[PDB]
């Protein structure tokens, strides 16, 4: 199986015990490291942050302590939008900029690979023509790779793809079949499955259905859209699980209804480290289940909540993370993705359960304690 684990490049500006730098990863904790994110300008790969290549040579040098690891830069993401995108595809001497572009980037900075994390074709103002545009990209971009590795006499760079969990996105989105030839692995994002745009309670990465979710409501799980894209295509082994070291908070509208589907009057508190609306990192939840917050069990759906006065969350533990991954297992996927390395309790100060903890429980899980980790010749 596969780990693979997001960094983000805006958790060095956290406060305190918040902030997080490449170095603070612990290179034996995931097989594949991938560094969100980069951008775009003139239908060229680019840096976003001001120290993204000092950020690179920290987080690509985790290779110098492990040397099975394999890195990949993340292109986009949800606030990067479609435009730049779509323009980038229209034609294909802008593909072709693109991919030469890549290709220099990710050598020069030492990444193994791309990681398309395109939020999505076909949506969010991008036109119809971008779902099988996508697809032509990718192989392209697949193709170019696999010429350049012979042309330097050097290992292939990778090509990944972060893609929805949505179905009307999937389907709007994703030449399935076509698609899954050219990836190497498929990162499905199988989290955001509920939030308060929805105005009651919800589960972030619910495993299976609650009995109350009918209709397209019933797709709402990692079950349903894990089976969703292997039944329409894509090869199992090839298929990555997306695991979530964050959760949704919520305002309750009544304190006293606290159960999955309670009525909420918006977003819950941003969090003192993170700082994100809706959203609490993993050792910002175990902060709220210190200061006296009560612990929820949602059995049919196999995740956690938690909820004190008029605040609920609904998140992910290592019991969770525990069954999310003897399930995977027994489907036999590729193995599992991490959002994110640096929203983990990593310090281990948090929640008294070692460093990494939700990171860990994968790692051992899927057989990976005894892996190799040993710096290069
Ligand atoms: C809100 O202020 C904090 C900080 O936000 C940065 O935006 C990012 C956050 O909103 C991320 N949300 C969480 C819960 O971590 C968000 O994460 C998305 C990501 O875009 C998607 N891509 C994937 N994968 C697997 C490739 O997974 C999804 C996750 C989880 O939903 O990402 C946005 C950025 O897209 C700001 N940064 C940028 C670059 O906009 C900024 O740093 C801000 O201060």
New binding site residues.
């Given amino acids: 199986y596969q780990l693979t684990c997001?960094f983000?490049?805006?958790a060095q500006?956290r406060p305190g015990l918040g902030r997080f730098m490449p170095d603070d990863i612990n290179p034996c904790l995931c097989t594949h490291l991938?560094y969100?994110?980069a951008g775009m300008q003139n239908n060229e790969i680019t840096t976003?942050e001001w120290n993204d290549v000092t950020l690179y040579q920290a987080f690509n040098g985790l290779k110098n302590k492990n040397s099975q690891l394999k890195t990949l830069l993340?292109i986009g993401?949800?606030?990067?939008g479609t435009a730049p995108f779509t323009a980038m595809v229209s034609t294909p001497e802008n593909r072709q900029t693109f991919i030469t572009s890549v290709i220099k980037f990710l050598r020069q900075y030492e990444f193994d690979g791309l990681?398309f994390?395109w939020?999505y074709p076909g949506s969010r103002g991008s036109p119809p023509q971008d779902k099988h545009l996508f697809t032509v990209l990718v192989q392209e971009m697949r193709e170019a790779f696999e010429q350049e590795a012979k042309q330097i006499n050097k290992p292939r760079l990778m090509v990944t793809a972060?893609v929805a969990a949505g179905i009307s996105n999937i389907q709007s989105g994703y030449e399935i079949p076509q698609l899954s030839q050219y990836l190497d692995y498929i990162?499905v994002?199988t989290?955001?499955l509920h939030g308060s745009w929805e105005g009651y309670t919800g589960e972030n990465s619910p495993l299976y259905k609650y009995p109350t979710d009918t209709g397209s409501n019933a797709y709402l799980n990692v079950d349903y859209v894990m089976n969703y894209w292997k039944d329409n295509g894509a090869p199992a082994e090839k298929l990555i699980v997306?695991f979530?070291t964050?959760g949704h908070n919520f305002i309750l509208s009544n304190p006293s209804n606290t159960g999955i589907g309670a009525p909420t009057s918006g977003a819950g508190p941003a969090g003192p480290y993170?700082?994100?609306?809706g959203?609490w990192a993993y050792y910002e939840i175990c902060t709220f289940l210190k200061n006296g917050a009560t612990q929820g069990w949602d059995a049919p759906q196999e995740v956690p909540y938690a909820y004190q006065g008029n605040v609920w969350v609904g998140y992910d533990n290592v019991k969770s993370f525990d069954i999310k991954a003897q399930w995977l297992k027994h489907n036999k996927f590729g193995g599992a993705?991490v959002?994110?390395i640096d929203?983990d309790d990593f310090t281990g100060t948090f929640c008294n359960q070692g460093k990494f903890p939700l990171i860990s429980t994968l790692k051992k899980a899927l057989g990976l304690q005894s892996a190799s980790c040993t710096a290069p010749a």
């Fill in positions: 997001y983000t490049n805006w500006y991938i969100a994110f976003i993340a993401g949800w606030n990067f990681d994390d939020e972060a990162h994002m989290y955001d997306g979530p964050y993170a700082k994100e609306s959203i993705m959002w994110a929203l």
